[PDB]
Amino acid sequence: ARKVTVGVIGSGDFAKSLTIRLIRCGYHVVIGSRNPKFASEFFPHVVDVTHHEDALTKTNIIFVAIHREHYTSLWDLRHLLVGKILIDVSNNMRINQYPESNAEYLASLFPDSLIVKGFNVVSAWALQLGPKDASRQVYICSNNIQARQQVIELARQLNFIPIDLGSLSSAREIENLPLRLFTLWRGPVVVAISLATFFFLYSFVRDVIHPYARNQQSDFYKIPIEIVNKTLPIVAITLLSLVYLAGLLAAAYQLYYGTKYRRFPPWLETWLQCRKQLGLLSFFFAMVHVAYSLCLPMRRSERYNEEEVWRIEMYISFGIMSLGLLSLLAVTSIPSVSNALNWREFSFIQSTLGYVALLISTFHVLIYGWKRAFEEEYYRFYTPPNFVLALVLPSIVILGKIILFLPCISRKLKRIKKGWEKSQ
Amino acid sequence: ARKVTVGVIGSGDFAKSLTIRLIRCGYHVVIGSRNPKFASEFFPHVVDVTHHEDALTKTNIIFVAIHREHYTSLWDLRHLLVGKILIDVSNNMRINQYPESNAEYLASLFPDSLIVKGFNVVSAWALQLGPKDASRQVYICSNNIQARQQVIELARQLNFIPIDLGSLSSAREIENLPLRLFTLWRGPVVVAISLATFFFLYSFVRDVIHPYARNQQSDFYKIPIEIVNKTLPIVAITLLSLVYLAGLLAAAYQLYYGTKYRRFPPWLETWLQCRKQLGLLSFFFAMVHVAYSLCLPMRRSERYNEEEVWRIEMYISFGIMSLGLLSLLAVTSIPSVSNALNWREFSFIQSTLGYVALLISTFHVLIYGWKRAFEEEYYRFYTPPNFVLALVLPSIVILGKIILFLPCISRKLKRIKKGWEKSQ
Amino acid sequence: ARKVTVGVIGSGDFAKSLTIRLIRCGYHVVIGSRNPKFASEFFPHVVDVTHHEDALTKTNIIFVAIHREHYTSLWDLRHLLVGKILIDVSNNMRINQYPESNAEYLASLFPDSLIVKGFNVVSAWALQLGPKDASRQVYICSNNIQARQQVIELARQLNFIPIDLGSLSSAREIENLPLRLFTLWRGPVVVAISLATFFFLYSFVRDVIHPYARNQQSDFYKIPIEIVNKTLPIVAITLLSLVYLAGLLAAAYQLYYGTKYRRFPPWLETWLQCRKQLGLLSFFFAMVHVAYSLCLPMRRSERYNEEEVWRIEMYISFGIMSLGLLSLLAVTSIPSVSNALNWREFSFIQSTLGYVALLISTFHVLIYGWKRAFEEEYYRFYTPPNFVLALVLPSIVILGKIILFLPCISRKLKRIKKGWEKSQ
Ligand SMILES: Cc1cc2nc3c(=O)[nH]c(=O)nc-3n(C[C@H](O)[C@H](O)[C@H](O)COP(=O)(O)OP(=O)(O)OC[C@H]3O[C@@H](n4cnc5c(N)ncnc54)[C@H](O)[C@@H]3O)c2cc1C
Ligand SMILES: Cc1cc2nc3c(=O)[nH]c(=O)nc-3n(C[C@H](O)[C@H](O)[C@H](O)COP(=O)(O)OP(=O)(O)OC[C@H]3O[C@@H](n4cnc5c(N)ncnc54)[C@H](O)[C@@H]3O)c2cc1C
Ligand SMILES: Cc1cc2nc3c(=O)[nH]c(=O)nc-3n(C[C@H](O)[C@H](O)[C@H](O)COP(=O)(O)OP(=O)(O)OC[C@H]3O[C@@H](n4cnc5c(N)ncnc54)[C@H](O)[C@@H]3O)c2cc1C
Ligand SMILES: NC(=O)c1ccc[n+]([C@@H]2O[C@H](COP(=O)([O-])OP(=O)(O)OC[C@H]3O[C@@H](n4cnc5c(N)ncnc54)[C@H](OP(=O)(O)O)[C@@H]3O)[C@@H](O)[C@H]2O)c1
Ligand SMILES: NC(=O)c1ccc[n+]([C@@H]2O[C@H](COP(=O)([O-])OP(=O)(O)OC[C@H]3O[C@@H](n4cnc5c(N)ncnc54)[C@H](OP(=O)(O)O)[C@@H]3O)[C@@H](O)[C@H]2O)c1
Ligand SMILES: NC(=O)c1ccc[n+]([C@@H]2O[C@H](COP(=O)([O-])OP(=O)(O)OC[C@H]3O[C@@H](n4cnc5c(N)ncnc54)[C@H](OP(=O)(O)O)[C@@H]3O)[C@@H](O)[C@H]2O)c1
Ligand code: HEM
Ligand code: HEM
Ligand code: HEM
Ligand SMILES: CC(C)CCC[C@@H](C)[C@H]1CC[C@H]2[C@@H]3CC=C4C[C@@H](O)CC[C@]4(C)[C@H]3CC[C@]12C
Ligand SMILES: CC(C)CCC[C@@H](C)[C@H]1CC[C@H]2[C@@H]3CC=C4C[C@@H](O)CC[C@]4(C)[C@H]3CC[C@]12C
Ligand SMILES: CC(C)CCC[C@@H](C)[C@H]1CC[C@H]2[C@@H]3CC=C4C[C@@H](O)CC[C@]4(C)[C@H]3CC[C@]12C
Ligand SMILES: CC(C)CCC[C@@H](C)[C@H]1CC[C@H]2[C@@H]3CC=C4C[C@@H](O)CC[C@]4(C)[C@H]3CC[C@]12C
Ligand SMILES: CC(C)CCC[C@@H](C)[C@H]1CC[C@H]2[C@@H]3CC=C4C[C@@H](O)CC[C@]4(C)[C@H]3CC[C@]12C
Ligand SMILES: CC(C)CCC[C@@H](C)[C@H]1CC[C@H]2[C@@H]3CC=C4C[C@@H](O)CC[C@]4(C)[C@H]3CC[C@]12C
């Protein structure tokens, strides 16, 4: 029933938190540091703190809890670290800082050891605490199977969820993972902000400034949130149109080149990768628009034609249908739901029901426009009304999709999708 | 640091996509085809394309990327495929097309080889691309442990998420998996459509046609979406009633037979299996009803008694309570949330809070009916009003559930639930 | 192709359901009972029911499907259970009933056997049925690797999802797991109920009783659900304030003590652990408030100043912003979404956007209060209006957070967060 000894190199924040987590989870830790005299009182009395040359002798699994630039300080400990699993927990301060990942550099430093990458994601504060809602998954990568399984078992005993990802070819991925902060959302968010700013300025120029000399009824105790009420929906529908224009453009490139075995242009690849983020931003903005259209027009201050009844009911119904379809798409976007669906079912949901949602949203805007545009006042300052642009982009998307259904084009796109593209 | 060679049989769409994915993920591929002269220019220069008899010699893991009906074309390669892992990636065009699954048929063809089922779910386009939101899980089944783990490691190196499911007894399941398209939703969707059509026709006959001779105030510029506003809620509540009538009927069958060790009738089994789909359809229709009741009655065109204040506030509150409980049930229906809950907690949530939601919905409809039914006009054309049916079904469900609480019945149902049913 | 024999000890409800599940999943079961004459007709004809001393001879994996207090009845079968995997499926009737878990007690009883904990979560009715939406994950813990993997494979063949959690140090956790019923929700729910009751009584005393002698316009055909409309929002905002006051107090304790390596007081630890439950309760109550504010003020019975337009639009917009941020936080609270986010991204979302949501909610309440408080009538009965308390708690939270941004305090808190706390 003797506890298994685990070695740790260095005495820092991560070393102390790791030692706490190991001791609480039924382990015995041997820590090697340059000056055990200095670091001995830091650690509890059940921690055996000695020199570098001593800790390695009495352990098999060693956490290299030092920074990358100090790895060469372990050069003298080359023949002691023979056949001993070295768990590399290091992290970089910048994505792609070095030509090779930290684990591969360590492996090149110590050819005879068994280098296992892992435990870098935890923050030396989740190690001190118990289970945490973000830092409960640890990714482990080693080119040696046995050492990888030993480290996975160690992670299991430390109340973690081990995740196996390969043979140090994945070390770069799990070193870049702790450093990323919504990398795929930056582009969609910038696009949404740009669209919102442009439509805000368009409404300000057309709706307010052009009749401002006529009326001039607003001051700083007024705000253009009638304009944000006209800006959120257009941004949402434009984001949906951008979600599906990427697929249209991919089809166009495939038809033009004649093969699917040609890499898309880098901008098209980035556009295709962030379609989920664009769609979720569109759903969020559509929901905010629904909230505004419910709360504001019906407020207590708002209390201060049969064909019109027709129109109002009909485009409200179309908006509700589109919102329901978008809600289905967003629900399927949860990782568990997406993984629980076949690729055929997921493709049906996303592609088909999103195209249907875009078409229904186009009708929902189109009715409003149909009896808000024929009056020459709203065709103001030579500038089309707000709904005209929010129609012109989904119109392009929908006409493209319909073009893709033509028999000649459908046949030339099936002959590509199904492999016979251009034999050579 | 030499790359591991992986063999592939055949040169088709799947073979080419698989070769691309293998080469990009640090592998070396040897492809065997009938005519290497023909297929050599198809594949890159780092691909060794030779005959069938040559590729097997220089590899250990071989992807049998050919259709099932051509498996007998490998009969001559029986003594070369001795002890070599054969990954069967084949798929059928129809569920339960053949008496035995593809993997088992291959294993019977080659008794001495190690047959591993896997990689059929990916679509030869997710292999070409990177990570995909539906095709990132691969299911692997082999009756040999070592070969199964080798194939799982191979899937890990190919940026997939290996899932182990057994010993080729699960081959049929993961061959039917790529072919299913919402199999459990078909029944609930057909039931919902039937209910919606019946209630639409009922409202058309009662609300419109019966006084149509009296008024005749509608034309084709009118639509019965006052009727869909009366059809969505009834369909939602009826779907909930059908969700819980299945449990009531299962209890009735258990009490009648005296044991739980008797298989339910096939219709009852299918009803019990699709309870989740019926409940989610009910939640979706209830949410659509909430959206209609918010957007339509308050529209700008809609602008064109204390006990009544009482009633309106009270049934709105009951509707909100029921919607909240249904939202809790739907949130627990996510696979991650369901797996994160104990069976006791999940049972409490679903059973208890869904019965409470059904009861509260019954009250919410019942108040509306209580002061919309006593007037003889709404008891029109000898036909009960719309809410009467939406009450009569949940009333049956609730009276059944209350009957199940009787001391004699509760005791006879505990003596069953807890094992003492009928000893023999 | 001979089936693998699996032994089962005892003949009860769990034994029968387990035997059914094993037989259906291609196994052959040998059941040992005290009186095979009695239990033989219970089980099918393909089940070999014999004495205790006979079943062990013809099997290797044995399910000890008897209660803990009867384990000593297997004392005579000590030398027969040598090297045989014993899967302990037992459960306790109370959390922490015994000093050592059931699996560890069994292991102490039989030192020479290989004890594996598992299959306790399933309810002897999910074993009889097929896949179930709560009982499809089984947790397995053994201090022997090989036996643990054998039991995991057995669980895989039984259409389960094996989960490995360690070396019998996790046996207590997975014995307590079937017994817990929302353990972390009890405290937050009691707090929410207490807040709701207190604010209901406060509104009853101030809003109704104090002018009750003045007007007396209500009877039992009236209800205080104008008061629940004033109670739900305050409870939601107070729950959010309590969510973040825990972090403020943790920071205060860290600054006072000078280290993060000191355990928080038990009440603070329990407060910190249940922050997710408090936040989700706050989100649920905020959504119920949104539903009430939409449905009730706009009802058909409700149909029975430019700066005010200003105010109404502005605080509605702030409420919508806060609801959107809370929705983002709740979406990230799904286990799949939380596990799919880096700890940095999850920390950003939760901490930063929740503080922003709290600030925006404070403004949203504050505008309403700003032009509903300056009238001396609402400062009624020497008691502050309802919004004043719902402001005073988030005000304390926000001033604390701002204090944490002071340069001296920020520096003393970074010197703690980053390890240099108090060297010894
Ligand atoms: C609310 C919301 C949530 C969303 N969530 C997600 C999400 O979680 N994940 C996600 O990925 N997206 C998500 N999306 C976006 C969604 O994936 C896209 O809208 C949808 O995939 C577009 O379908 P498509 O037909 O344009 O593209 P696809 O079907 O993906 O194909 C794009 C292009 O590739 C071609 N192509 C397709 N299959 C093949 C093949 N086998 N061989 C050759 N060429 C082929 C098509 O012809 C087309 O030119 C979401 C969108 C919304 C609105
Ligand atoms: C929005 C929504 C979402 C839903 N999501 C899901 C979902 O994700 N998954 C899902 O499965 N369902 C889901 N449902 C449906 C839900 O499961 C059912 O409403 C609920 O289980 C019915 O409870 P019950 O008491 O009728 O049935 P159960 O408790 O399941 O039992 C049915 C019958 O079996 C008997 N029985 C139960 N336990 C035993 C036992 N141990 N031994 C012998 N007999 C027993 C009962 O007496 C009864 O006769 C959802 C419903 C809704 C509205
Ligand atoms: C709708 C909703 C859903 C929610 N869902 C969840 C959920 O799923 N999971 C969950 O956990 N919470 C959840 N929450 C609550 C959420 O986690 C908290 O609101 C948030 O974490 C508080 O941030 P903080 O800065 O106060 O605390 P934290 O950042 O967690 O830190 C608390 C204290 O620890 C200190 N500290 C932090 N990091 C370190 C460190 N490295 N070293 C030393 N000291 C440190 C801080 O200074 C502070 O004193 C939810 C809340 C809401 C409203
Ligand atoms: N939150 C975290 O801290 C965290 C989280 C994840 C991963 N990590 C990784 O874990 C490792 C430990 O980080 P840390 O925060 O603990 O680092 P730190 O506080 O900077 O500690 C540096 C450690 O390196 C040792 N060291 C050895 N040779 C050295 C040299 N020449 N110069 C300087 N130091 C030398 C020191 O040990 P002596 O006492 O013997 O000098 C000391 O224990 C890093 O690789 C980090 O990327 C940290
Ligand atoms: N999207 C997909 O394509 C996909 C996805 C998942 C699974 N799969 C499975 O993967 C396998 C490959 O599918 P595929 O689409 O690549 O098929 P395909 O395009 O029809 O190719 C058929 C292949 O079979 C070989 N073959 C051998 N003997 C043959 C014979 N007698 N008659 C005809 N062909 C013979 C051919 O090789 P030669 O050049 O030597 O003649 C050719 O490479 C199938 O089992 C399929 O079910 C495919
Ligand atoms: N839903 C469930 O039932 C469920 C779920 C999860 C886990 N479990 C666990 O699985 C085990 C089986 O539970 P169960 O519900 O089947 O129990 P049960 O109905 O009470 O059966 C008791 C069993 O213990 C045997 N036994 C041996 N020595 C005994 C003694 N001295 N006194 C009494 N019985 C003795 C009996 O076998 P003989 O015929 O030879 O006397 C009988 O088969 C328990 O440990 C339970 O915690 C049960
Ligand atoms: C319950 C669901 C919805 C309701 C009740 C609703 C309501 C409305 C209303 C009343 C208008 C008239 C303009 C205004 O009031 O400011 C409008 C316009 C608009 N709707 Fe919606 N909507 C819904 C969903 C959606 C969705 C999901 C989309 C797009 C994905 C969308 C796209 C638009 C657009 C772009 C406009 C712009 C028209 C203009 O600014 O002139 N709507 N909506
Ligand atoms: C915020 C939540 C809800 C609100 C505001 C609401 C509102 C209403 C209103 C105003 C009516 C009167 C009939 C009408 O206006 O067309 C009604 C009727 C009805 N409600 Fe709801 N409801 C809600 C939730 C629900 C839910 C969740 C269910 C069932 C699961 C439900 C079941 C019904 C049914 C069946 C009727 C039919 C009455 C009739 O057609 O005569 N309601 N609801
Ligand atoms: C769409 C979102 C929201 C809308 C439309 C809304 C609407 C309102 C309205 C109209 C009032 C005036 C008092 C009343 O009508 O009873 C109010 C008050 C209040 N709001 Fe909201 N709200 C929203 C979201 C929120 C959220 C998310 C919170 C807190 C997390 C919140 C906190 C409060 C509080 C505490 C009051 C109390 C004021 C009082 O009782 O005097 N609101 N809200
Ligand atoms: C993050 C996502 C949303 C980015 C999508 C933004 C779109 C509108 C941007 C991003 C990159 C852009 C492309 C970048 C480069 C070129 C080449 C030149 O001929 C101008 C047009 C063209 C082809 C641009 C078209 C618009 C474009 C595709
Ligand atoms: C929204 C838009 C971008 C959707 C795509 C429309 C355009 C780009 C597509 C639709 C029809 C396509 C054409 C269909 C047929 C041919 C004939 C052959 O020579 C291949 C290219 C060519 C000439 C295609 C070029 C691209 C094309 C013109
Ligand atoms: C997919 C789900 C929702 C199906 C539920 C539909 C219900 C209403 C249908 C489906 C199958 C049907 C049963 C099929 C067969 C019989 C036998 C005969 O005596 C008529 C009634 C009875 C017992 C039917 C009752 C109604 C029933 C249970
Ligand atoms: C909604 C409905 C279907 C719920 C179930 C109600 C009916 C079917 C149930 C409830 C009470 C049950 C009875 C309770 C007691 C007995 C006595 C004994 O001889 C077993 C059968 C019998 C006669 C049961 C038959 C089924 C029964 C009548
Ligand atoms: C389950 C969660 C929400 C519990 C949070 C409830 C809060 C308000 C309660 C729970 C435990 C309580 C603490 C328990 C003990 C003490 C010590 C004494 O000096 C009184 C105050 C103090 C410090 C209490 C302050 C309020 C407190 C922190
Ligand atoms: C909402 C509230 C609880 C937030 C926290 C505010 C209080 C408790 C915090 C904020 C500023 C803190 C002080 C900042 C600086 C010092 C000086 C040094 O001697 C450490 C303790 C001491 C004296 C701290 C004690 C705790 C403190 C006073």
Author numbering:
A (entry chain B), B (entry chain A), C (entry chain C): 28 to 331, 350 to 469
What does the original paper state about this entry?
Six transmembrane epithelial antigen of the prostate (STEAP) 1–4 are membrane-embedded hemoproteins that chelate a heme prosthetic group in a transmembrane domain (TMD). STEAP2–4, but not STEAP1, have an intracellular oxidoreductase domain (OxRD) and can mediate cross-membrane electron transfer from NADPH via FAD and heme. Each STEAP protein has a transmembrane domain (TMD) which consists of six transmembrane helices (TM), and STEAP2–4, but not STEAP1, also have an N-terminal intracellular oxidoreductase domain (OxRD). Discovery of STEAP2–4 soon followed, and further analyses show that STEAP2–4 have metal ion reductase activities.
